[PDB]
PDB file of N, CA and C in Angstrom:
ATOM      1  N   UNK A  21     108.308 107.076  92.940  1.00 44.88           N
ATOM      2  CA  UNK A  21     107.160 106.934  93.624  1.00 44.88           C
ATOM      3  C   UNK A  21     106.121 106.501  92.207  1.00 44.88           C
ATOM      4  N   UNK A  22     104.749 106.698  92.576  1.00 43.70           N
ATOM      5  CA  UNK A  22     103.681 105.976  91.978  1.00 43.70           C
ATOM      6  C   UNK A  22     104.254 105.486  90.503  1.00 43.70           C
ATOM      7  N   UNK A  23     104.745 106.887  89.499  1.00 42.70           N
ATOM      8  CA  UNK A  23     104.763 106.752  88.151  1.00 42.70           C
ATOM      9  C   UNK A  23     106.084 105.919  87.883  1.00 42.70           C
ATOM     10  N   UNK A  24     107.091 106.116  88.687  1.00 44.38           N
ATOM     11  CA  UNK A  24     108.225 105.187  88.176  1.00 44.38           C
ATOM     12  C   UNK A  24     107.490 103.743  88.206  1.00 44.38           C
ATOM     13  N   UNK A  25     107.619 103.529  89.449  1.00 40.57           N
ATOM     14  CA  UNK A  25     107.214 102.099  90.390  1.00 40.57           C
ATOM     15  C   UNK A  25     105.489 100.852  89.203  1.00 40.57           C
ATOM     16  N   UNK A  26     104.919 101.899  88.659  1.00 43.16           N
ATOM     17  CA  UNK A  26     104.180 101.840  88.256  1.00 43.16           C
ATOM     18  C   UNK A  26     102.968 101.644  86.398  1.00 43.16           C
ATOM     19  N   UNK A  27     103.810 102.700  86.269  1.00 44.14           N
ATOM     20  CA  UNK A  27     103.881 103.305  85.200  1.00 44.14           C
ATOM     21  C   UNK A  27     105.225 103.332  84.188  1.00 44.14           C
ATOM     22  N   UNK A  28     106.134 103.863  84.697  1.00 46.14           N
ATOM     23  CA  UNK A  28     107.500 103.389  83.691  1.00 46.14           C
ATOM     24  C   UNK A  28     107.934 101.806  84.091  1.00 46.14           C
ATOM     25  N   UNK A  29     107.760 101.600  85.569  1.00 45.67           N
ATOM     26  CA  UNK A  29     107.934 100.137  85.160  1.00 45.67           C
ATOM     27  C   UNK A  29     106.797  99.321  85.656  1.00 45.67           C
ATOM     28  N   UNK A  30     106.324  97.345  86.008  1.00 44.45           N
ATOM     29  CA  UNK A  30     105.393  97.400  86.118  1.00 44.45           C
ATOM     30  C   UNK A  30     105.199  97.028  87.925  1.00 44.45           C
ATOM     31  N   UNK A  31     103.889  97.847  88.040  1.00 48.39           N
ATOM     32  CA  UNK A  31     103.963  96.870  90.063  1.00 48.39           C
ATOM     33  C   UNK A  31     103.181  96.135  90.402  1.00 48.39           C
ATOM     34  N   UNK A  32     102.957  95.899  91.520  1.00 51.62           N
ATOM     35  CA  UNK A  32     102.379  94.361  91.918  1.00 51.62           C
ATOM     36  C   UNK A  32     100.863  94.960  92.538  1.00 51.62           C
ATOM     37  N   UNK A  33     100.538  94.182  93.242  1.00 50.99           N
ATOM     38  CA  UNK A  33      98.592  95.084  93.896  1.00 50.99           C
ATOM     39  C   UNK A  33      99.616  95.154  95.068  1.00 50.99           C
ATOM     40  N   UNK A  34     100.536  94.666  95.947  1.00 51.57           N
ATOM     41  CA  UNK A  34     101.137  94.585  97.077  1.00 51.57           C
ATOM     42  C   UNK A  34     101.900  96.269  96.929  1.00 51.57           C
ATOM     43  N   UNK A  35     102.397  96.828  95.993  1.00 51.57           N
ATOM     44  CA  UNK A  35     102.915  97.742  95.776  1.00 51.57           C
ATOM     45  C   UNK A  35     102.002  99.188  95.182  1.00 51.57           C
ATOM     46  N   UNK A  36     100.921  98.681  94.754  1.00 54.40           N
ATOM     47  CA  UNK A  36      99.971 100.241  94.889  1.00 54.40           C
ATOM     48  C   UNK A  36      99.206 100.462  96.058  1.00 54.40           C
ATOM     49  N   UNK A  37      98.612  99.123  96.675  1.00 55.91           N
ATOM     50  CA  UNK A  37      98.245  99.460  97.893  1.00 55.91           C
ATOM     51  C   UNK A  37      99.100 100.364  98.872  1.00 55.91           C
ATOM     52  N   UNK A  38     100.247 100.530  98.445  1.00 57.24           N
ATOM     53  CA  UNK A  38     100.946 101.465  99.325  1.00 57.24           C
ATOM     54  C   UNK A  38     100.841 102.648  99.100  1.00 57.24           C
ATOM     55  N   UNK A  39     100.316 103.103  97.626  1.00 60.82           N
ATOM     56  CA  UNK A  39      99.784 104.271  97.528  1.00 60.82           C
ATOM     57  C   UNK A  39      98.040 104.566  97.707  1.00 60.82           C
ATOM     58  N   UNK A  40      97.759 103.653  98.729  1.00 57.55           N
ATOM     59  CA  UNK A  40      96.252 104.482  98.527  1.00 57.55           C
ATOM     60  C   UNK A  40      96.378 105.030 100.048  1.00 57.55           C
ATOM     61  N   UNK A  41      95.452 106.355 100.098  1.00 59.03           N
ATOM     62  CA  UNK A  41      95.448 106.830 101.844  1.00 59.03           C
ATOM     63  C   UNK A  41      96.796 107.656 101.663  1.00 59.03           C
TER      64      UNK A  41
ATOM     65  N   UNK B  10      99.395  92.042  77.256  1.00 60.79           N
ATOM     66  CA  UNK B  10      98.690  92.842  77.260  1.00 60.79           C
ATOM     67  C   UNK B  10      99.947  94.790  77.332  1.00 60.79           C
ATOM     68  N   UNK B  11      99.427  95.716  77.768  1.00 62.57           N
ATOM     69  CA  UNK B  11     100.157  96.924  78.138  1.00 62.57           C
ATOM     70  C   UNK B  11      99.950  96.569  79.840  1.00 62.57           C
ATOM     71  N   UNK B  12     100.753  96.535  80.444  1.00 64.27           N
ATOM     72  CA  UNK B  12     100.902  96.140  82.004  1.00 64.27           C
ATOM     73  C   UNK B  12     101.209  97.292  82.792  1.00 64.27           C
ATOM     74  N   UNK B  13     101.008  98.479  82.367  1.00 63.55           N
ATOM     75  CA  UNK B  13     101.940  99.666  83.172  1.00 63.55           C
ATOM     76  C   UNK B  13     100.488 100.621  83.255  1.00 63.55           C
ATOM     77  N   UNK B  14     100.158 101.098  84.138  1.00 62.37           N
ATOM     78  CA  UNK B  14      98.998 101.916  84.818  1.00 62.37           C
ATOM     79  C   UNK B  14      99.792 103.084  85.261  1.00 62.37           C
ATOM     80  N   UNK B  15      99.529 104.463  83.930  1.00 63.52           N
ATOM     81  CA  UNK B  15     100.061 105.607  83.870  1.00 63.52           C
ATOM     82  C   UNK B  15      98.350 106.958  83.236  1.00 63.52           C
ATOM     83  N   UNK B  16      99.051 107.860  83.941  1.00 66.54           N
ATOM     84  CA  UNK B  16      97.496 108.820  83.863  1.00 66.54           C
ATOM     85  C   UNK B  16      95.611 108.337  84.570  1.00 66.54           C
ATOM     86  N   UNK B  17      94.881 108.348  83.718  1.00 64.30           N
ATOM     87  CA  UNK B  17      93.865 107.617  84.180  1.00 64.30           C
ATOM     88  C   UNK B  17      94.017 106.256  84.570  1.00 64.30           C
ATOM     89  N   UNK B  18      94.329 105.119  83.678  1.00 61.97           N
ATOM     90  CA  UNK B  18      94.332 104.392  83.815  1.00 61.97           C
ATOM     91  C   UNK B  18      95.033 103.982  85.647  1.00 61.97           C
ATOM     92  N   UNK B  19      95.827 104.943  85.960  1.00 62.13           N
ATOM     93  CA  UNK B  19      96.372 104.809  87.156  1.00 62.13           C
ATOM     94  C   UNK B  19      95.631 105.110  88.163  1.00 62.13           C
ATOM     95  N   UNK B  20      94.811 106.093  88.105  1.00 59.58           N
ATOM     96  CA  UNK B  20      93.413 106.313  88.994  1.00 59.58           C
ATOM     97  C   UNK B  20      92.762 105.337  88.887  1.00 59.58           C
ATOM     98  N   UNK B  21      92.187 104.799  88.270  1.00 60.30           N
ATOM     99  CA  UNK B  21      91.215 104.010  88.184  1.00 60.30           C
ATOM    100  C   UNK B  21      91.780 102.600  88.669  1.00 60.30           C
ATOM    101  N   UNK B  22      93.026 102.241  88.735  1.00 60.54           N
ATOM    102  CA  UNK B  22      93.612 101.127  89.448  1.00 60.54           C
ATOM    103  C   UNK B  22      93.504 101.589  90.625  1.00 60.54           C
ATOM    104  N   UNK B  23      93.767 102.638  91.220  1.00 58.89           N
ATOM    105  CA  UNK B  23      93.714 102.905  92.600  1.00 58.89           C
ATOM    106  C   UNK B  23      92.366 103.171  93.305  1.00 58.89           C
ATOM    107  N   UNK B  24      90.628 103.645  92.170  1.00 57.38           N
ATOM    108  CA  UNK B  24      90.232 104.149  92.627  1.00 57.38           C
ATOM    109  C   UNK B  24      89.934 101.749  92.959  1.00 57.38           C
ATOM    110  N   UNK B  25      89.668 101.468  92.689  1.00 57.84           N
ATOM    111  CA  UNK B  25      89.105  99.831  92.428  1.00 57.84           C
ATOM    112  C   UNK B  25      90.220  99.035  93.527  1.00 57.84           C
ATOM    113  N   UNK B  26      91.691  99.031  93.884  1.00 59.57           N
ATOM    114  CA  UNK B  26      92.175  98.513  94.916  1.00 59.57           C
ATOM    115  C   UNK B  26      92.006  99.128  96.270  1.00 59.57           C
ATOM    116  N   UNK B  27      92.126 100.632  95.859  1.00 59.71           N
ATOM    117  CA  UNK B  27      92.235 101.130  97.544  1.00 59.71           C
ATOM    118  C   UNK B  27      90.373 101.566  98.172  1.00 59.71           C
ATOM    119  N   UNK B  28      89.408 101.362  97.577  1.00 57.65           N
ATOM    120  CA  UNK B  28      88.221 101.068  97.873  1.00 57.65           C
ATOM    121  C   UNK B  28      88.367 101.843  98.302  1.00 57.65           C
ATOM    122  N   UNK B  29      87.565 101.869 100.313  1.00 58.73           N
ATOM    123  CA  UNK B  29      86.859 102.558 100.950  1.00 58.73           C
ATOM    124  C   UNK B  29      87.929 103.405 101.862  1.00 58.73           C
ATOM    125  N   UNK B  30      88.743 103.395 101.707  1.00 62.56           N
ATOM    126  CA  UNK B  30      90.114 103.651 102.051  1.00 62.56           C
ATOM    127  C   UNK B  30      90.405 105.310 101.356  1.00 62.56           C
ATOM    128  N   UNK B  31      90.301 105.245 100.263  1.00 63.48           N
ATOM    129  CA  UNK B  31      90.641 106.242  99.102  1.00 63.48           C
ATOM    130  C   UNK B  31      92.246 106.690  98.900  1.00 63.48           C
ATOM    131  N   UNK B  32      92.748 108.149  98.211  1.00 64.49           N
ATOM    132  CA  UNK B  32      94.026 107.542  97.968  1.00 64.49           C
ATOM    133  C   UNK B  32      94.369 109.130  97.141  1.00 64.49           C
ATOM    134  N   UNK B  33      95.283 109.494  97.445  1.00 61.72           N
ATOM    135  CA  UNK B  33      95.796 110.833  96.523  1.00 61.72           C
ATOM    136  C   UNK B  33      95.539 110.899  95.308  1.00 61.72           C
ATOM    137  N   UNK B  34      94.948 111.836  94.192  1.00 63.84           N
ATOM    138  CA  UNK B  34      94.244 112.803  94.488  1.00 63.84           C
ATOM    139  C   UNK B  34      92.704 112.646  93.496  1.00 63.84           C
TER     140      UNK B  34
ATOM    141  N   UNK C  26      99.519 105.541 102.983  1.00 62.90           N
ATOM    142  CA  UNK C  26     100.187 106.274 102.197  1.00 62.90           C
ATOM    143  C   UNK C  26     100.644 108.030 101.943  1.00 62.90           C
ATOM    144  N   UNK C  27     100.556 108.924 101.137  1.00 61.98           N
ATOM    145  CA  UNK C  27     100.690 110.351 101.608  1.00 61.98           C
ATOM    146  C   UNK C  27      99.860 110.664 102.015  1.00 61.98           C
ATOM    147  N   UNK C  28      98.371 110.140 102.200  1.00 61.07           N
ATOM    148  CA  UNK C  28      97.381 111.216 103.049  1.00 61.07           C
ATOM    149  C   UNK C  28      97.535 110.901 104.731  1.00 61.07           C
ATOM    150  N   UNK C  29      97.923 109.464 105.022  1.00 62.38           N
ATOM    151  CA  UNK C  29      97.888 109.344 105.796  1.00 62.38           C
ATOM    152  C   UNK C  29      99.301 109.880 106.955  1.00 62.38           C
ATOM    153  N   UNK C  30     100.398 109.897 105.863  1.00 61.68           N
ATOM    154  CA  UNK C  30     101.482 110.399 106.152  1.00 61.68           C
ATOM    155  C   UNK C  30     101.846 112.547 105.928  1.00 61.68           C
ATOM    156  N   UNK C  31     101.161 112.560 105.700  1.00 64.94           N
ATOM    157  CA  UNK C  31     101.632 113.970 105.471  1.00 64.94           C
ATOM    158  C   UNK C  31     100.655 115.107 105.494  1.00 64.94           C
ATOM    159  N   UNK C  32      99.002 114.367 105.436  1.00 63.56           N
ATOM    160  CA  UNK C  32      98.021 115.025 105.897  1.00 63.56           C
ATOM    161  C   UNK C  32      96.616 114.811 107.408  1.00 63.56           C
ATOM    162  N   UNK C  33      96.921 113.675 107.333  1.00 64.60           N
ATOM    163  CA  UNK C  33      96.632 112.911 108.704  1.00 64.60           C
ATOM    164  C   UNK C  33      97.382 113.386 109.452  1.00 64.60           C
ATOM    165  N   UNK C  34      99.023 112.975 109.378  1.00 65.31           N
ATOM    166  CA  UNK C  34     100.152 112.896 110.239  1.00 65.31           C
ATOM    167  C   UNK C  34     100.581 114.509 109.453  1.00 65.31           C
ATOM    168  N   UNK C  35     102.459 114.548 110.209  1.00 65.53           N
ATOM    169  CA  UNK C  35     102.762 115.087 109.536  1.00 65.53           C
ATOM    170  C   UNK C  35     103.663 114.701 108.943  1.00 65.53           C
ATOM    171  N   UNK C  36     104.831 115.186 107.467  1.00 65.69           N
ATOM    172  CA  UNK C  36     106.024 114.694 107.114  1.00 65.69           C
ATOM    173  C   UNK C  36     106.854 115.703 106.854  1.00 65.69           C
ATOM    174  N   UNK C  37     108.154 114.570 106.653  1.00 66.09           N
ATOM    175  CA  UNK C  37     109.610 115.635 106.378  1.00 66.09           C
ATOM    176  C   UNK C  37     109.371 115.844 105.033  1.00 66.09           C
ATOM    177  N   UNK C  38     110.282 116.238 104.554  1.00 66.36           N
ATOM    178  CA  UNK C  38     110.042 117.036 103.110  1.00 66.36           C
ATOM    179  C   UNK C  38     110.875 115.119 102.064  1.00 66.36           C
ATOM    180  N   UNK C  39     111.882 114.848 103.020  1.00 63.65           N
ATOM    181  CA  UNK C  39     111.932 113.736 102.507  1.00 63.65           C
ATOM    182  C   UNK C  39     110.892 112.679 102.569  1.00 63.65           C
ATOM    183  N   UNK C  40     110.302 112.750 103.126  1.00 64.25           N
ATOM    184  CA  UNK C  40     109.200 111.470 103.352  1.00 64.25           C
ATOM    185  C   UNK C  40     108.306 112.329 101.737  1.00 64.25           C
ATOM    186  N   UNK C  41     108.004 113.830 102.295  1.00 64.22           N
ATOM    187  CA  UNK C  41     107.367 113.948 100.498  1.00 64.22           C
ATOM    188  C   UNK C  41     108.237 113.704  99.410  1.00 64.22           C
ATOM    189  N   UNK C  42     108.803 113.819  99.085  1.00 64.45           N
ATOM    190  CA  UNK C  42     109.802 113.936  98.095  1.00 64.45           C
ATOM    191  C   UNK C  42     109.953 112.125  97.491  1.00 64.45           C
ATOM    192  N   UNK C  43     109.158 111.345  98.177  1.00 62.10           N
ATOM    193  CA  UNK C  43     109.147 109.935  97.825  1.00 62.10           C
ATOM    194  C   UNK C  43     107.852 110.013  97.335  1.00 62.10           C
ATOM    195  N   UNK C  44     107.343 110.860  96.901  1.00 62.14           N
ATOM    196  CA  UNK C  44     105.715 110.968  96.653  1.00 62.14           C
ATOM    197  C   UNK C  44     106.191 111.443  95.161  1.00 62.14           C
ATOM    198  N   UNK C  45     106.815 111.815  94.707  1.00 62.94           N
ATOM    199  CA  UNK C  45     107.265 112.350  93.883  1.00 62.94           C
ATOM    200  C   UNK C  45     107.670 111.177  92.747  1.00 62.94           C
ATOM    201  N   UNK C  46     107.109 111.499  91.744  1.00 66.35           N
ATOM    202  CA  UNK C  46     107.451 110.527  90.116  1.00 66.35           C
ATOM    203  C   UNK C  46     107.122 109.394  90.257  1.00 66.35           C
TER     204      UNK C  46
ATOM    205  N   UNK D  14     101.016 127.267 113.006  1.00 67.32           N
ATOM    206  CA  UNK D  14     100.874 127.047 112.212  1.00 67.32           C
ATOM    207  C   UNK D  14      99.928 125.628 111.723  1.00 67.32           C
ATOM    208  N   UNK D  15      99.253 125.469 110.883  1.00 69.10           N
ATOM    209  CA  UNK D  15      99.119 124.058 110.235  1.00 69.10           C
ATOM    210  C   UNK D  15      99.775 123.248 109.845  1.00 69.10           C
ATOM    211  N   UNK D  16     100.383 122.188 110.157  1.00 71.28           N
ATOM    212  CA  UNK D  16     102.038 121.469 109.271  1.00 71.28           C
ATOM    213  C   UNK D  16     101.450 120.968 108.852  1.00 71.28           C
ATOM    214  N   UNK D  17      99.873 120.511 108.347  1.00 67.60           N
ATOM    215  CA  UNK D  17      99.188 118.991 108.150  1.00 67.60           C
ATOM    216  C   UNK D  17      99.289 120.093 105.688  1.00 67.60           C
ATOM    217  N   UNK D  18      99.286 118.840 105.252  1.00 68.14           N
ATOM    218  CA  UNK D  18      99.191 118.866 104.314  1.00 68.14           C
ATOM    219  C   UNK D  18      98.020 118.366 102.820  1.00 68.14           C
ATOM    220  N   UNK D  19      97.148 119.266 102.876  1.00 69.36           N
ATOM    221  CA  UNK D  19      96.364 117.613 102.535  1.00 69.36           C
ATOM    222  C   UNK D  19      95.647 118.869 101.465  1.00 69.36           C
ATOM    223  N   UNK D  20      94.843 117.961 100.556  1.00 67.38           N
ATOM    224  CA  UNK D  20      93.868 118.299  99.561  1.00 67.38           C
ATOM    225  C   UNK D  20      94.905 119.217  98.277  1.00 67.38           C
ATOM    226  N   UNK D  21      94.749 120.330  98.658  1.00 64.48           N
ATOM    227  CA  UNK D  21      95.339 121.225  96.979  1.00 64.48           C
ATOM    228  C   UNK D  21      95.923 122.006  97.406  1.00 64.48           C
ATOM    229  N   UNK D  22      96.855 121.538  99.135  1.00 66.99           N
ATOM    230  CA  UNK D  22      97.948 122.306 100.166  1.00 66.99           C
ATOM    231  C   UNK D  22      98.769 121.492  99.551  1.00 66.99           C
ATOM    232  N   UNK D  23      98.502 119.879  99.390  1.00 72.51           N
ATOM    233  CA  UNK D  23      99.245 118.949  99.562  1.00 72.51           C
ATOM    234  C   UNK D  23      99.686 118.797  98.166  1.00 72.51           C
ATOM    235  N   UNK D  24      98.734 119.140  96.682  1.00 73.67           N
ATOM    236  CA  UNK D  24      98.943 119.233  95.122  1.00 73.67           C
ATOM    237  C   UNK D  24     100.526 120.339  94.820  1.00 73.67           C
ATOM    238  N   UNK D  25      99.867 121.649  96.007  1.00 72.77           N
ATOM    239  CA  UNK D  25     101.095 122.610  95.918  1.00 72.77           C
ATOM    240  C   UNK D  25     102.196 122.456  96.269  1.00 72.77           C
ATOM    241  N   UNK D  26     102.256 121.813  97.620  1.00 76.98           N
ATOM    242  CA  UNK D  26     103.690 120.746  97.628  1.00 76.98           C
ATOM    243  C   UNK D  26     104.200 120.332  97.095  1.00 76.98           C
ATOM    244  N   UNK D  27     104.055 119.426  96.696  1.00 74.57           N
ATOM    245  CA  UNK D  27     104.271 118.197  95.588  1.00 74.57           C
ATOM    246  C   UNK D  27     104.653 119.032  94.216  1.00 74.57           C
ATOM    247  N   UNK D  28     103.930 120.179  93.597  1.00 74.64           N
ATOM    248  CA  UNK D  28     104.512 120.899  92.740  1.00 74.64           C
ATOM    249  C   UNK D  28     106.045 121.409  92.959  1.00 74.64           C
ATOM    250  N   UNK D  29     105.582 122.185  94.117  1.00 77.19           N
ATOM    251  CA  UNK D  29     107.146 123.235  94.856  1.00 77.19           C
ATOM    252  C   UNK D  29     108.366 121.939  94.653  1.00 77.19           C
ATOM    253  N   UNK D  30     108.344 120.938  95.741  1.00 76.95           N
ATOM    254  CA  UNK D  30     109.455 119.915  96.293  1.00 76.95           C
ATOM    255  C   UNK D  30     109.690 119.416  94.688  1.00 76.95           C
ATOM    256  N   UNK D  31     108.823 118.604  94.166  1.00 78.23           N
ATOM    257  CA  UNK D  31     109.091 117.724  93.152  1.00 78.23           C
ATOM    258  C   UNK D  31     109.350 118.264  92.050  1.00 78.23           C
ATOM    259  N   UNK D  32     109.371 119.708  91.423  1.00 77.81           N
ATOM    260  CA  UNK D  32     109.912 120.112  90.317  1.00 77.81           C
ATOM    261  C   UNK D  32     109.866 119.554  89.268  1.00 77.81           C
ATOM    262  N   UNK D  33     110.785 119.700  88.503  1.00 77.21           N
ATOM    263  CA  UNK D  33     111.023 118.930  87.320  1.00 77.21           C
ATOM    264  C   UNK D  33     110.674 116.970  87.057  1.00 77.21           C
ATOM    265  N   UNK D  34     111.162 116.714  88.062  1.00 76.99           N
ATOM    266  CA  UNK D  34     110.270 115.092  88.216  1.00 76.99           C
ATOM    267  C   UNK D  34     108.946 115.040  87.604  1.00 76.99           C
ATOM    268  N   UNK D  35     107.880 116.043  89.001  1.00 75.24           N
ATOM    269  CA  UNK D  35     107.269 115.772  88.727  1.00 75.24           C
ATOM    270  C   UNK D  35     105.935 114.521  89.437  1.00 75.24           C
ATOM    271  N   UNK D  36     104.639 114.634  89.252  1.00 77.55           N
ATOM    272  CA  UNK D  36     104.562 113.694  90.456  1.00 77.55           C
ATOM    273  C   UNK D  36     103.057 113.227  90.032  1.00 77.55           C
ATOM    274  N   UNK D  37     102.661 112.408  90.921  1.00 77.51           N
ATOM    275  CA  UNK D  37     101.325 111.458  90.119  1.00 77.51           C
ATOM    276  C   UNK D  37     100.116 112.600  91.152  1.00 77.51           C
ATOM    277  N   UNK D  38      98.866 113.268  91.125  1.00 80.19           N
ATOM    278  CA  UNK D  38      98.257 112.645  89.245  1.00 80.19           C
ATOM    279  C   UNK D  38      98.568 114.679  88.993  1.00 80.19           C
TER     280      UNK D  38
END
């Protein structure tokens, strides 16, 4: 999920905005 | 720099990028 | 994201567990 | 029933199903 993708790893803007709304 | 976004920095990043859309939680 | 998928709409267990971690 | 999960019910559903894994936020 977002923690694996953005915290554990490094995520792009595109990946991050997928966790909007 | 640290390029990881965890906890309150992840929260802030979402505020920022999601804008008016909003985000959980 | 999760709000569209699970709140606005109805989501399955499988979709929901994708927002774990 | 309401089959929608919003706000604190979405939070609870995630507690439940994610277990030890955890979840944001």
